[PDB]
Chains A and B, each alone.
Chain A
Amino acid sequence: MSVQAEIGILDHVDGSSEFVSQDTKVICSVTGPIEPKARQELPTQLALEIIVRPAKGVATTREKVLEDKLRAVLTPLITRHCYPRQLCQITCQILESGEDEAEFSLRELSCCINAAFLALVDAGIALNSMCASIPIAIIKDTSDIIVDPTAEQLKISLSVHTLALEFVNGGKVVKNVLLLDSNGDFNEDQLFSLLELGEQKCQELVTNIRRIIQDNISPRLVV
């Protein structure tokens, strides 16, 4: 396989999703809009308090760096002014990484971002645009780009890159780039190659997630 996504699986929470990308498997919940804690009351804004918890061992400093990365992306995805003075806690539990957690975060991160989008779709919280994120590596053997890499391919990386882009006017016009985190050595001609490919490979992923939400929503909402 490639990717699979389901929504609605969890029943006690306002919205939820299960994102699986090959070996990598992230299950997500959005809870809220709910009653703010006083330290997480913000005046005009919805608050975000994101938690990433790894499968193996217990969450550390790493997951805060991930939280920041997630929080960056999610702040213009969720309509902040939609709820003033309410909190939303997004709790992302990793059921399998299937890689090495300290070393590579490429698949882990991309998966969380997508499960967060879906969960928020199920939740009903306003979403301006479609977001997905794809993982891109470069392997040293050919000294070239391999899109959507497996666990083996990640080991033999010299460098690794995630991109996330905001999708409007048919979910197919790139509005903006909400992330481009390019770690390891790159020079510019690769990097604009990673955008280019990146564009088209994202838009496929957007098609697939788009399709999934319609099919799963449609027997629920009927007329």
Chain B
Amino acid sequence: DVAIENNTLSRYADAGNIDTKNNILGSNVLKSGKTIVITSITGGIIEEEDIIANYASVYPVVEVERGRVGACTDEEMTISQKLHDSILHSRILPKKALKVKAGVRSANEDGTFSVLYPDEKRKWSYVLYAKIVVLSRTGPVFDLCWNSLMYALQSVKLPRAFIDERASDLRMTIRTRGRSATIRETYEIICDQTKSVPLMINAKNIAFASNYGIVELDPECQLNTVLIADLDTEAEETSIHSTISILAAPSGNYKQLTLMGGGAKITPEMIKRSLLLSRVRADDLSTRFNI
């Protein structure tokens, strides 16, 4: 079972507190079994259909804790990249959405300051990260990371962003000890979170994951083909070599199925049952947290 608490960690958890030591865009805590996944989604600022290159990706770090003093292990890195990959191919975040514009922040000599809004020279896009840490992994964790990510993403708001009059003629005098190009223009753009407009997102492309196993039972080897849904213990992670990972979305659209047929027999009959289980689980989670 899956239990989430949202906005217990995000900057924007309250309306009467905006504190500058916080910047967490969207956030979720999700507990399943004993395995607990804490998701924080965080921005940055980079000055710049159905085609894959118009959808953007989160650039996550997924950190897993299994008693390893490090945090740069081969198990966690493969997770993080595969996770970037899933988000690309599921097509959630169109690049128009991070493509924001800036208004004007003009200080007055009237002892007031006016930060002027456009309707929300140069251009900018944001980037999105996710710092996901995992405490006491007991089985396949991938689907937990994906479930929490979505509740977070649908809680993401983005700061507003502003620039001064004659931004294109503001100076940089930061570089020194050249050799030319030690005085130039630059653009400089602060972000202000006194207003934050909420993330524009493609709902249809939200998925929620599950995990499967295919395994055989033999009566003389505890001296046909059997389907397990989801994996929770060490024993299941170790020896259920034939497994299917599905991300199913809750209209009968699927954004990834990955079958790894590590040795045992798979008839497609098992595959055909799992694609239905996964959408019905998707429909359960959906209605359960109204997100």
A169 within 8 A of B: no
Q: How far is the CB of B245 from chain A (nearest CB, A)?
A: 10
Given contacts A65-B85, A155-B51, contact A179 B252 (CB under 8 A): no
Expressed in whole angstroms, the minimum distance between the Cβ of B60 and any Cβ of chain A is 10
Q: Does B260 contact A (CB under 8 A)?
A: yes
Q: Tell me the nearest residue of chain B to A175, going by C-beta.
A: B265
Name the B residues within 8 Å of A29 (CB-CB): none
- Find B81's partner among A62, A104, A184 (CB 8 Å cutoff): A62
Q: Judge whether B256 is part of the interface by a CB distance below 8 angstroms.
A: yes
Does A217 sit within 8 A of B, measured CB to CB? no
Q: Which residues of A contact B265 (CB under 8 A)?
A: 176
Q: A64 contacts B254, CB within 8 Å?
A: no
Establish whether residues A176 and B261, one from each chain, have CB atoms under 8 Å apart when the complex forms: yes
**A212: Cβ under 8 A from any B Cβ:** no
A64 and B53 contacting across the interface, CB-CB below 8 Å? no
With a cutoff of 8 Å between Cβ atoms, the chain B residues found around residue A76 in the complex are 241, 261-263
Would you list which residues of chain A between 57 and 86 have a CB under 8 Å from chain B? 60-62, 64-65, 67-68, 72-73, 75-76
Which B residues are CB-close (under 8 A) to A187? Answer: 252-254
What's the Cα separation between A62 and B259 when bound, in Å? 19
Contacts of B254 in A (CB 8 A): 182, 185-187
- Render B247-287 as a binary contact track against A, CB cut-off 8 A, 1 for contact: 00000111111111111111010001001000000000000
Interface residues of B in 59-92 (CB under 8 A from A): 74, 77-78, 80-82, 85, 88-89, 91
Q: Which residues of A contact B262 (CB under 8 A)?
A: 72, 75-76
Choose one: B53, B78, B85, B266; the contact of A177 (CB below 8 Å): B266
Within 8 A of B (CB), among A152-201: 155-158, 166, 176-188, 191-192, 195
Chain A positions within 8 Å of B257 at CB level: 180-182, 186, 191
CB distance from A152 to the nearest CB of B (A): 13
Query: For B226, what are the chain A residues with a Cβ–Cβ distance below 8 Å?
Result: none
Does A140 sit at the interface, judged by CB under 8 A?
yes
Which residues of B sit under 8 angstroms from A192, Cβ to Cβ? 268
Q: Quick one: given A61-B81, A140-B50, are A179 and B253 in contact (CB under 8 Å)?
A: no
Distance in angstroms from A47 CB to nearest chain B CB is 13
**Closest residue of B by beta carbon distance from A163:** B259
Q: Cβ of A68 and Cβ of B78 under 8 Å apart?
A: yes
User: Does B52 interact with chain A (Cβ within 8 Å)?
Assistant: yes
Contact of A183 among B51, B74, B89, B259 (CB under 8 A): B89
Q: Is A103 an interface residue (CB 8 A)?
A: yes
What is the minimal beta-carbon distance from A189 to any residue of chain B, in angstroms?
11
Nearest residue in B to A165 (C-beta to C-beta)? B261
How many A-B Cβ pairs are below 8 Å? 84
Contact B253 A177 (CB under 8 A): no
* Residue contact A179 to B259, C-beta cutoff 8 Å: yes
B52 nearest CB neighbor, chain A only: A103
Q: How far is the CA of A176 from the CA of B260 in the complex (A)?
A: 11
B167-196 near A? 1/0 per residue, CB < 8 Å: 000000000000000000000000000000
Are B255 and A61 touching (Cβ within 8 A)?
no
| Also in contact, A72 and B268, with CB within 8 A (given A186-B254, A187-B253) | no
Q: How far is the CB of B24 from chain A (nearest CB, A)?
A: 24
CA distance A215 to B68 in the complex (A): 51
CA distance A178 to B263 in the complex (A): 7
List, in ascending order, chain B residues with CB within 8 A of A185's CB.
91, 253-255
Quick one: given A103-B53, A157-B52, are A183 and B260 in contact (CB under 8 Å)?
no
Q: Which residues of B contact A176 (CB under 8 A)?
A: 261, 263-266
Query: What's the least CB distance linking A177 to chain B, in Å?
Result: 5
B80-A183 in contact (CB<8A): no
Report chain A residues within 8 Å CB of B253: 185, 187
**B89 x A184 contact (CB < 8 A):** yes
* CB-based contact A181/B252 at 8 Å: no
In the complex the two chains form, is B89's CB within 8 Å of A65's CB?
Answer: no
- A interface list, Cβ under 8 A from B: 60-62, 64-65, 67-68, 72-73, 75-76, 103-104, 140, 155-158, 166, 176-188, 191-192, 195
6 contacts between A and B (CB under 8 A): A62-B81, A103-B52, A157-B52, A176-B264, A185-B254, A187-B253
Smallest CB-CB A-B distances: 7 pairs: A61-B81, A76-B263, A183-B89, A72-B260, A180-B259, A178-B261, A64-B78
Q: A61-B78, A188-B275 are in contact. List 17 more A-B contacts (CB 8 A).
A: A61-B80, A64-B81, A72-B260, A72-B261, A75-B241, A76-B261, A103-B53, A179-B258, A179-B259, A181-B258, A183-B89, A184-B52, A185-B91, A186-B257, A187-B254, A191-B257, A195-B268
